[PDB]
């Protein structure tokens, strides 16, 4: 009532698109099964207006939907016999000529849950289910959502309202949490960290008896939907709440303290997922404070969780550097610090690495760490909340970008060593690995601030489940389930989603150099915003050219962190892709791109044209008036207008800055304010 | 105990610098007199180790210090007979050949208070008082201190600790307030606003019975020291706390509400000073919200205070403008909005105008409003807290700058129309006028963050009392009273104070263009920090030149706001002073200054040399080790080292930015990072 159902609308079908089912055969009664059955009942009731009775044994003459695991089957057919993944499932229509029967067979209860959501997805999409033969197994073992929620209700980099978990340094008194779990589970998400990785005072206590009871009831809900719960922890907890004099991972007492803490947590949460950790910080002691490396820091926590089966999600966070020193390169830090530690991390430690080596910029090359540590589990994080991609004011469907990252061939083991094979664990046989996304939700009625940003959460789940899914089909699924099957609506909103990222990049930072945003809140144009800061985020634009020389020949030597094939491509000025040119080379404004445009003219072109493309997004949306409910139609239109106006600011600020510096006018004579 | 006595040290004199007094003749017993006597007793006891008995009638044979007003005198001599100002006083040694008698004669009790502090000042300075003949009358009627303290304890732009007035949305349970009052009164300050001009939720209630009792006891203390209390108010109070539907100054009920509020305040504070007001704001209704002008807005409040004798301190606050439009000029706003309203303001309304038309930058030309409104009371505000002048990390004695402003001849009535004559009311016969300073104090033990910043508070008071005092004598007075009379200490610290402003300006914004600071907190270099914002603070630096064209001939026409003499000086490229060139003209980097330096080389010169000058400040201070107590010696050294390091950052960031844009190298080949 207070919020949208997002893509789980289960809109009532017309009289010609219904199914005839009299019973739902639930072979089990576990908490997950109860949630699964409830979801099926809700979907069939809302969509088909039918209320099949729930039974535990098939009625030979009734049209039924059978739910169970291989173990509950009478005749285990070949197809389901090939299932090896615990979360895998099979859906097949009985080939008999009698009653209509749909079999949703999962390897485990979780598999049945995902199978039912898949079945419900087919119904929402209006697919013919008369002769189904489906087998699905997730590619990534860990498909996680990371929350940056604080207990005071705020969300770090949250642009969709306040936390739905906390308020006034306490837990909110849980219906929305259940619906959130339903949404996550519908797209296969099986893990979640509920609190900000930057753990503050109150949040540090989430691992104590004071809050564990509340954390436990939240975990109880997520469990019913196959979701394991994680907590971000304060490495200095032994000091702050443990009464100990040090936080040193090698200190005997500190080690004991964490083991007892883990034991305590599992008493409340038997299947606790583990800890998400950002180990050094600038205001509290961390591993480096005592001269310990990342392996020593991570392994201590891993040892505390090991007896319970917990995992340590270790943030590969390596702050000030001098803008004066062009030999130092922030982009090289992650690889330089962790690559040497390969093989020294415990088996239940997973290094969390961002898609790029900097910080979720509109475009960044792939983190060199992927493919470089065959002996260390790795998990890629992407950012669903649009910190540097429009903050849900500007539309930006991130799926296309994530696919470019996932399909990037690292050539770690020769051709066919794509990032997705690295993180799904197949390339190096990782015990634990996967993908994570920083949540883009909040208390706003539409969950994500921008109605269309719901596609990024949905899309993240889809890719996490199977990176091979196309951006086109993912967008199609989301649009149809969320706005219906009207041909124009589908084609239009899909086009909007698929073109959005490129459009936003067009009027923001050029050719992969990134940044150029206002400091602090990171929203809006400010070319020199961090140009002279100690954050190592520089473009080095001067009156003659721009770009970071990251070549081995004359620059920072960052290209060498990639395997030979990619190293050479980026190293050479003539082979380096235009879209990443300024991230790898410092070139004159007159340098001609593969597109034929000079670097400076390219800047003007994409910025002027990006705004016109944004105007098109709005125009195409306006043409759908009458085919979308008034509330959502206006919610989105308001945002698109905000986008258009801001795009004009991005366009002009950037064009003027570069005109003022280069002195080179726009080839086409468009308006550049002096 | 918890804080420094600042300049009221009253250090014990040696055996050869003492005075012989047996009695203090206090002719009156008012609260002010009791404070006055206590101060004299404290000073004489600490400095002279004597404890004269306090009596009400002179003892013909006793060495005495006589305190009283003309009315208490037996033989009213000529000198004191010339006193016309209520706060004026005379100090003279009896010319008899018998007992030693010092007469401190004031026009009113306040005059006696200021006379005693003057007498105590002479003692601290070691002046010969055997034959005194002194007459003093303050030039400015209003000598005010404005606090930006918030009730949650924070201080907007406060760099010396938390508020000494508030904490946890309440008043602090008052000894420091008394000592603060003593400090203010010692330098003649007679008015104070205790809360932030930006009035928030809790602060809005300072005008209600809930807090008035506390405000009253604070006011009681200040009264004993001749200080009138003011409150900053929320123009939208009728809505927020009055339960009214509008804040419109023309609304009959709103007008009544303010009258009743004033009446209520005076019941608690009979001599309440009035309101400090910033009338429109962006989150609450103000005069402009209802289409009313500044006169209508200010006069409504003036009418509420008029029956009680209260005054309305109206902030001349005129926010977004477009950086694209070079015809619009923020510097012109104040004059354009208020000049036309001259003569429409009630007599008890005083327009508060900043020394400059922008916002307390290291250097700004004088606000054109001074001298332009002969029919409207005007008060100049200066900023003691160093928002854009080092934030008390960098040393910056602001007295020299304030004197340049006060001595600026507006030629409003021909030669001899200096700003000081405008604000002291002599030029236009203003009923109420003066000067105000934004407080630079906080809870820090040394009150001002930087020990030497105590000189800015002291210095503000001295100038407020008599703008004709030289920066040299003011610095001398402060150094001697605060650190003693050692020849080297005096000469060194004085040199440091007197050179500090120019040094800081040398490595910050060039030739009066201002800004070039980090957005938000405003500390540190960021040349383009606000270059593309909507704040109207631009330098327009490009690859060929820099500066704002404010000329009538080709620019914004700002020069015309000054009278002919100054208008012409700034209008012409060859006569415009170098120090303000970039504020008035946009010129090529190769433009040659009166100094012979090109604009670009001047930038390099002052930035490289400014850092070397900062290093000198530290060097000269280090040479005083052993002649200053260890605590204060190290407190200051720590800050000077912080200054040196930051100056290096200012130097390099600015030099690199301009090298990158101009392409012109440093004439002397000093290190500029590419």
PDB file of C-alpha atoms in Angstrom, chain A residues 246-457:
ATOM      1  CA  UNK A 246      44.390  -3.495  20.950  1.00  0.00           C
ATOM      2  CA  UNK A 247      42.742  -4.618  17.697  1.00  0.00           C
ATOM      3  CA  UNK A 248      45.905  -6.296  16.396  1.00  0.00           C
ATOM      4  CA  UNK A 249      44.854  -9.477  14.504  1.00  0.00           C
ATOM      5  CA  UNK A 250      47.941 -11.234  15.854  1.00  0.00           C
ATOM      6  CA  UNK A 251      47.114 -10.384  19.476  1.00  0.00           C
ATOM      7  CA  UNK A 252      46.086 -13.641  21.205  1.00  0.00           C
ATOM      8  CA  UNK A 253      43.172 -12.002  23.037  1.00  0.00           C
ATOM      9  CA  UNK A 254      41.864 -10.177  19.966  1.00  0.00           C
ATOM     10  CA  UNK A 255      41.775 -13.492  18.086  1.00  0.00           C
ATOM     11  CA  UNK A 256      39.891 -15.113  20.963  1.00  0.00           C
ATOM     12  CA  UNK A 257      37.479 -12.166  21.163  1.00  0.00           C
ATOM     13  CA  UNK A 258      36.438 -12.601  17.533  1.00  0.00           C
ATOM     14  CA  UNK A 259      35.971 -16.349  17.927  1.00  0.00           C
ATOM     15  CA  UNK A 260      33.662 -15.780  20.902  1.00  0.00           C
ATOM     16  CA  UNK A 261      31.845 -13.073  18.966  1.00  0.00           C
ATOM     17  CA  UNK A 262      31.286 -15.438  16.036  1.00  0.00           C
ATOM     18  CA  UNK A 263      30.097 -18.187  18.380  1.00  0.00           C
ATOM     19  CA  UNK A 264      27.681 -15.716  19.980  1.00  0.00           C
ATOM     20  CA  UNK A 265      26.266 -14.631  16.611  1.00  0.00           C
ATOM     21  CA  UNK A 266      25.645 -18.177  15.412  1.00  0.00           C
ATOM     22  CA  UNK A 267      23.666 -18.929  18.564  1.00  0.00           C
ATOM     23  CA  UNK A 268      21.172 -16.320  17.336  1.00  0.00           C
ATOM     24  CA  UNK A 269      21.719 -17.006  13.631  1.00  0.00           C
ATOM     25  CA  UNK A 270      22.734 -20.665  12.973  1.00  0.00           C
ATOM     26  CA  UNK A 271      23.243 -20.013   9.267  1.00  0.00           C
ATOM     27  CA  UNK A 272      24.852 -16.561   9.591  1.00  0.00           C
ATOM     28  CA  UNK A 273      26.577 -15.656   6.332  1.00  0.00           C
ATOM     29  CA  UNK A 274      29.636 -13.895   7.673  1.00  0.00           C
ATOM     30  CA  UNK A 275      31.271 -10.476   7.774  1.00  0.00           C
ATOM     31  CA  UNK A 276      31.725  -7.756   5.144  1.00  0.00           C
ATOM     32  CA  UNK A 277      34.896  -5.893   6.072  1.00  0.00           C
ATOM     33  CA  UNK A 278      36.676  -2.636   5.299  1.00  0.00           C
ATOM     34  CA  UNK A 279      39.695  -3.090   7.487  1.00  0.00           C
ATOM     35  CA  UNK A 280      41.596   0.117   7.910  1.00  0.00           C
ATOM     36  CA  UNK A 281      40.320   3.236   8.614  1.00  0.00           C
ATOM     37  CA  UNK A 282      41.477   6.416   9.320  1.00  0.00           C
ATOM     38  CA  UNK A 283      39.842   7.019  12.693  1.00  0.00           C
ATOM     39  CA  UNK A 284      40.133   3.505  14.138  1.00  0.00           C
ATOM     40  CA  UNK A 285      42.902   0.886  14.456  1.00  0.00           C
ATOM     41  CA  UNK A 286      43.138  -1.685  11.680  1.00  0.00           C
ATOM     42  CA  UNK A 287      45.592  -4.355  10.442  1.00  0.00           C
ATOM     43  CA  UNK A 288      47.970  -1.745   9.006  1.00  0.00           C
ATOM     44  CA  UNK A 289      47.940   0.088  12.341  1.00  0.00           C
ATOM     45  CA  UNK A 290      49.996  -2.812  13.704  1.00  0.00           C
ATOM     46  CA  UNK A 291      51.990  -3.428  10.544  1.00  0.00           C
ATOM     47  CA  UNK A 292      49.968  -6.496   9.548  1.00  0.00           C
ATOM     48  CA  UNK A 293      49.069  -7.188   5.918  1.00  0.00           C
ATOM     49  CA  UNK A 294      45.658  -7.936   4.411  1.00  0.00           C
ATOM     50  CA  UNK A 295      46.115 -11.705   4.685  1.00  0.00           C
ATOM     51  CA  UNK A 296      46.862 -11.559   8.410  1.00  0.00           C
ATOM     52  CA  UNK A 297      43.956  -9.175   8.891  1.00  0.00           C
ATOM     53  CA  UNK A 298      41.461 -11.223   6.885  1.00  0.00           C
ATOM     54  CA  UNK A 299      42.605 -14.662   8.061  1.00  0.00           C
ATOM     55  CA  UNK A 300      42.075 -13.815  11.732  1.00  0.00           C
ATOM     56  CA  UNK A 301      38.381 -13.140  11.074  1.00  0.00           C
ATOM     57  CA  UNK A 302      38.163 -16.141   8.747  1.00  0.00           C
ATOM     58  CA  UNK A 303      39.476 -18.376  11.523  1.00  0.00           C
ATOM     59  CA  UNK A 304      36.769 -17.090  13.866  1.00  0.00           C
ATOM     60  CA  UNK A 305      34.055 -17.900  11.311  1.00  0.00           C
ATOM     61  CA  UNK A 306      35.501 -21.152   9.954  1.00  0.00           C
ATOM     62  CA  UNK A 307      34.020 -23.543  12.563  1.00  0.00           C
ATOM     63  CA  UNK A 308      30.584 -22.109  11.798  1.00  0.00           C
ATOM     64  CA  UNK A 309      30.883 -22.003   8.008  1.00  0.00           C
ATOM     65  CA  UNK A 310      30.955 -18.217   7.824  1.00  0.00           C
ATOM     66  CA  UNK A 311      32.652 -16.190   5.101  1.00  0.00           C
ATOM     67  CA  UNK A 312      34.799 -13.072   5.199  1.00  0.00           C
ATOM     68  CA  UNK A 313      33.975 -10.586   2.439  1.00  0.00           C
ATOM     69  CA  UNK A 314      37.175  -8.548   2.392  1.00  0.00           C
ATOM     70  CA  UNK A 315      36.982  -5.124   0.769  1.00  0.00           C
ATOM     71  CA  UNK A 316      40.137  -4.570  -1.305  1.00  0.00           C
ATOM     72  CA  UNK A 317      40.505  -1.083   0.120  1.00  0.00           C
ATOM     73  CA  UNK A 318      43.770  -0.046  -0.023  1.00  0.00           C
ATOM     74  CA  UNK A 319      43.757   8.126   0.281  1.00  0.00           C
ATOM     75  CA  UNK A 320      46.431  10.511   0.123  1.00  0.00           C
ATOM     76  CA  UNK A 321      48.608  10.715  -2.491  1.00  0.00           C
ATOM     77  CA  UNK A 322      50.234  13.785  -4.005  1.00  0.00           C
ATOM     78  CA  UNK A 323      48.782  15.179  -7.233  1.00  0.00           C
ATOM     79  CA  UNK A 324      52.295  16.469  -7.943  1.00  0.00           C
ATOM     80  CA  UNK A 325      53.721  12.953  -8.282  1.00  0.00           C
ATOM     81  CA  UNK A 326      52.782  11.538 -11.686  1.00  0.00           C
ATOM     82  CA  UNK A 327      54.647   8.290 -10.970  1.00  0.00           C
ATOM     83  CA  UNK A 328      52.149   7.223  -8.309  1.00  0.00           C
ATOM     84  CA  UNK A 329      48.892   5.816  -9.690  1.00  0.00           C
ATOM     85  CA  UNK A 330      45.806   5.055  -7.601  1.00  0.00           C
ATOM     86  CA  UNK A 331      44.634   2.686 -10.345  1.00  0.00           C
ATOM     87  CA  UNK A 332      47.654   0.455  -9.651  1.00  0.00           C
ATOM     88  CA  UNK A 333      47.155   0.221  -5.870  1.00  0.00           C
ATOM     89  CA  UNK A 334      44.682  -2.674  -5.579  1.00  0.00           C
ATOM     90  CA  UNK A 335      46.722  -5.030  -7.774  1.00  0.00           C
ATOM     91  CA  UNK A 336      50.064  -3.967  -6.278  1.00  0.00           C
ATOM     92  CA  UNK A 337      48.829  -4.634  -2.740  1.00  0.00           C
ATOM     93  CA  UNK A 338      46.867  -7.873  -3.206  1.00  0.00           C
ATOM     94  CA  UNK A 339      48.511  -9.679  -6.129  1.00  0.00           C
ATOM     95  CA  UNK A 340      51.572 -10.556  -3.981  1.00  0.00           C
ATOM     96  CA  UNK A 341      49.290 -11.981  -1.288  1.00  0.00           C
ATOM     97  CA  UNK A 342      47.745 -14.548  -3.623  1.00  0.00           C
ATOM     98  CA  UNK A 343      47.698 -17.926  -1.896  1.00  0.00           C
ATOM     99  CA  UNK A 344      48.058 -16.537   1.630  1.00  0.00           C
ATOM    100  CA  UNK A 345      44.327 -16.056   2.281  1.00  0.00           C
ATOM    101  CA  UNK A 346      42.245 -18.669   4.104  1.00  0.00           C
ATOM    102  CA  UNK A 347      39.701 -20.585   2.022  1.00  0.00           C
ATOM    103  CA  UNK A 348      36.666 -18.783   3.494  1.00  0.00           C
ATOM    104  CA  UNK A 349      37.992 -15.335   2.621  1.00  0.00           C
ATOM    105  CA  UNK A 350      36.646 -13.700  -0.532  1.00  0.00           C
ATOM    106  CA  UNK A 351      38.311 -10.532  -1.826  1.00  0.00           C
ATOM    107  CA  UNK A 352      35.654  -8.001  -2.829  1.00  0.00           C
ATOM    108  CA  UNK A 353      36.855  -6.050  -5.864  1.00  0.00           C
ATOM    109  CA  UNK A 354      35.014  -3.216  -7.642  1.00  0.00           C
ATOM    110  CA  UNK A 355      34.403  -3.597 -11.368  1.00  0.00           C
ATOM    111  CA  UNK A 356      37.012  -0.888 -11.910  1.00  0.00           C
ATOM    112  CA  UNK A 357      40.291   0.070 -10.153  1.00  0.00           C
ATOM    113  CA  UNK A 358      39.119   3.550  -9.165  1.00  0.00           C
ATOM    114  CA  UNK A 359      35.598   4.099  -7.819  1.00  0.00           C
ATOM    115  CA  UNK A 360      32.474   3.260  -9.807  1.00  0.00           C
ATOM    116  CA  UNK A 361      32.958   5.969 -12.461  1.00  0.00           C
ATOM    117  CA  UNK A 362      30.589   6.133 -15.464  1.00  0.00           C
ATOM    118  CA  UNK A 363      33.301   4.184 -17.274  1.00  0.00           C
ATOM    119  CA  UNK A 364      36.438   2.528 -15.942  1.00  0.00           C
ATOM    120  CA  UNK A 365      38.584  -0.210 -17.434  1.00  0.00           C
ATOM    121  CA  UNK A 366      38.314  -3.596 -15.681  1.00  0.00           C
ATOM    122  CA  UNK A 367      40.159  -4.120 -12.380  1.00  0.00           C
ATOM    123  CA  UNK A 368      43.415  -5.940 -13.240  1.00  0.00           C
ATOM    124  CA  UNK A 369      42.964  -8.092 -10.117  1.00  0.00           C
ATOM    125  CA  UNK A 370      40.387 -10.228 -11.909  1.00  0.00           C
ATOM    126  CA  UNK A 371      42.346 -13.106 -13.427  1.00  0.00           C
ATOM    127  CA  UNK A 372      45.515 -12.336 -11.452  1.00  0.00           C
ATOM    128  CA  UNK A 373      44.915 -14.382  -8.289  1.00  0.00           C
ATOM    129  CA  UNK A 374      44.238 -18.032  -9.220  1.00  0.00           C
ATOM    130  CA  UNK A 375      44.695 -19.043  -5.567  1.00  0.00           C
ATOM    131  CA  UNK A 376      42.360 -16.495  -3.976  1.00  0.00           C
ATOM    132  CA  UNK A 377      38.556 -16.388  -4.090  1.00  0.00           C
ATOM    133  CA  UNK A 378      37.288 -13.205  -5.736  1.00  0.00           C
ATOM    134  CA  UNK A 379      33.947 -11.424  -5.841  1.00  0.00           C
ATOM    135  CA  UNK A 380      33.184  -8.407  -8.008  1.00  0.00           C
ATOM    136  CA  UNK A 381      31.151  -5.546  -6.619  1.00  0.00           C
ATOM    137  CA  UNK A 382      29.197  -3.254  -8.758  1.00  0.00           C
ATOM    138  CA  UNK A 383      27.275  -0.210  -7.628  1.00  0.00           C
ATOM    139  CA  UNK A 384      23.523  -0.241  -8.207  1.00  0.00           C
ATOM    140  CA  UNK A 385      23.008   3.059  -6.394  1.00  0.00           C
ATOM    141  CA  UNK A 386      24.007   5.645  -9.018  1.00  0.00           C
ATOM    142  CA  UNK A 387      26.652   7.611  -7.095  1.00  0.00           C
ATOM    143  CA  UNK A 388      28.549   8.762 -10.185  1.00  0.00           C
ATOM    144  CA  UNK A 389      25.906   7.761 -12.705  1.00  0.00           C
ATOM    145  CA  UNK A 390      23.099  10.267 -12.149  1.00  0.00           C
ATOM    146  CA  UNK A 391      22.046   9.535  -8.563  1.00  0.00           C
ATOM    147  CA  UNK A 392      18.691   8.318  -9.864  1.00  0.00           C
ATOM    148  CA  UNK A 393      17.896  11.799 -11.174  1.00  0.00           C
ATOM    149  CA  UNK A 394      19.380  10.947 -14.571  1.00  0.00           C
ATOM    150  CA  UNK A 395      18.293   7.633 -16.080  1.00  0.00           C
ATOM    151  CA  UNK A 396      21.096   5.074 -16.286  1.00  0.00           C
ATOM    152  CA  UNK A 397      20.409   1.374 -16.925  1.00  0.00           C
ATOM    153  CA  UNK A 398      23.685  -0.150 -15.723  1.00  0.00           C
ATOM    154  CA  UNK A 399      23.235  -3.650 -17.172  1.00  0.00           C
ATOM    155  CA  UNK A 400      24.973  -2.894 -20.487  1.00  0.00           C
ATOM    156  CA  UNK A 401      28.053  -1.656 -18.617  1.00  0.00           C
ATOM    157  CA  UNK A 402      28.138  -4.638 -16.289  1.00  0.00           C
ATOM    158  CA  UNK A 403      27.977  -6.968 -19.275  1.00  0.00           C
ATOM    159  CA  UNK A 404      31.005  -5.226 -20.836  1.00  0.00           C
ATOM    160  CA  UNK A 405      32.855  -5.909 -17.582  1.00  0.00           C
ATOM    161  CA  UNK A 406      31.675  -9.521 -17.240  1.00  0.00           C
ATOM    162  CA  UNK A 407      32.486 -10.284 -20.880  1.00  0.00           C
ATOM    163  CA  UNK A 408      35.933  -8.664 -20.712  1.00  0.00           C
ATOM    164  CA  UNK A 409      38.461 -11.371 -21.607  1.00  0.00           C
ATOM    165  CA  UNK A 410      41.407 -11.182 -19.207  1.00  0.00           C
ATOM    166  CA  UNK A 411      43.228 -13.875 -21.198  1.00  0.00           C
ATOM    167  CA  UNK A 412      44.443 -15.116 -17.804  1.00  0.00           C
ATOM    168  CA  UNK A 413      44.444 -18.652 -19.215  1.00  0.00           C
ATOM    169  CA  UNK A 414      44.414 -17.600 -22.846  1.00  0.00           C
ATOM    170  CA  UNK A 415      41.379 -16.745 -24.971  1.00  0.00           C
ATOM    171  CA  UNK A 416      38.154 -17.391 -23.080  1.00  0.00           C
ATOM    172  CA  UNK A 417      39.169 -16.073 -19.660  1.00  0.00           C
ATOM    173  CA  UNK A 418      36.358 -13.546 -19.223  1.00  0.00           C
ATOM    174  CA  UNK A 419      35.768 -11.825 -15.884  1.00  0.00           C
ATOM    175  CA  UNK A 420      32.530 -13.784 -15.477  1.00  0.00           C
ATOM    176  CA  UNK A 421      34.499 -17.059 -15.573  1.00  0.00           C
ATOM    177  CA  UNK A 422      36.813 -15.637 -12.934  1.00  0.00           C
ATOM    178  CA  UNK A 423      34.095 -14.658 -10.480  1.00  0.00           C
ATOM    179  CA  UNK A 424      31.785 -17.608 -11.102  1.00  0.00           C
ATOM    180  CA  UNK A 425      34.741 -19.707  -9.976  1.00  0.00           C
ATOM    181  CA  UNK A 426      34.986 -21.901 -13.081  1.00  0.00           C
ATOM    182  CA  UNK A 427      38.313 -20.539 -14.344  1.00  0.00           C
ATOM    183  CA  UNK A 428      40.294 -21.134 -11.138  1.00  0.00           C
ATOM    184  CA  UNK A 429      37.950 -23.510  -9.321  1.00  0.00           C
ATOM    185  CA  UNK A 430      37.184 -21.008  -6.549  1.00  0.00           C
ATOM    186  CA  UNK A 431      35.490 -22.558  -3.519  1.00  0.00           C
ATOM    187  CA  UNK A 432      33.524 -19.353  -2.846  1.00  0.00           C
ATOM    188  CA  UNK A 433      33.024 -16.543  -5.353  1.00  0.00           C
ATOM    189  CA  UNK A 434      30.449 -14.425  -7.104  1.00  0.00           C
ATOM    190  CA  UNK A 435      29.097 -10.932  -7.478  1.00  0.00           C
ATOM    191  CA  UNK A 436      27.699  -8.204  -5.232  1.00  0.00           C
ATOM    192  CA  UNK A 437      25.775  -4.996  -5.821  1.00  0.00           C
ATOM    193  CA  UNK A 438      25.493  -1.916  -3.606  1.00  0.00           C
ATOM    194  CA  UNK A 439      21.758  -1.490  -2.977  1.00  0.00           C
ATOM    195  CA  UNK A 440      19.903   1.305  -4.749  1.00  0.00           C
ATOM    196  CA  UNK A 441      16.801   1.138  -2.552  1.00  0.00           C
ATOM    197  CA  UNK A 442      15.336   3.321   0.157  1.00  0.00           C
ATOM    198  CA  UNK A 443      12.054   4.229   1.852  1.00  0.00           C
ATOM    199  CA  UNK A 444      10.688   6.022  -1.244  1.00  0.00           C
ATOM    200  CA  UNK A 445       7.357   4.488  -2.374  1.00  0.00           C
ATOM    201  CA  UNK A 446       8.965   3.385  -5.640  1.00  0.00           C
ATOM    202  CA  UNK A 447      11.958   1.911  -3.747  1.00  0.00           C
ATOM    203  CA  UNK A 448      14.657   3.293  -6.052  1.00  0.00           C
ATOM    204  CA  UNK A 449      13.947   7.025  -6.302  1.00  0.00           C
ATOM    205  CA  UNK A 450      13.665   6.871 -10.075  1.00  0.00           C
ATOM    206  CA  UNK A 451      10.938   4.402 -11.082  1.00  0.00           C
ATOM    207  CA  UNK A 452      13.058   3.108 -13.950  1.00  0.00           C
ATOM    208  CA  UNK A 453      15.996   2.463 -11.602  1.00  0.00           C
ATOM    209  CA  UNK A 454      13.994  -0.553 -10.464  1.00  0.00           C
ATOM    210  CA  UNK A 455      15.426  -2.089 -13.641  1.00  0.00           C
ATOM    211  CA  UNK A 456      18.951  -1.884 -12.216  1.00  0.00           C
ATOM    212  CA  UNK A 457      18.085  -3.947  -9.138  1.00  0.00           C
TER     213      UNK A 457
END
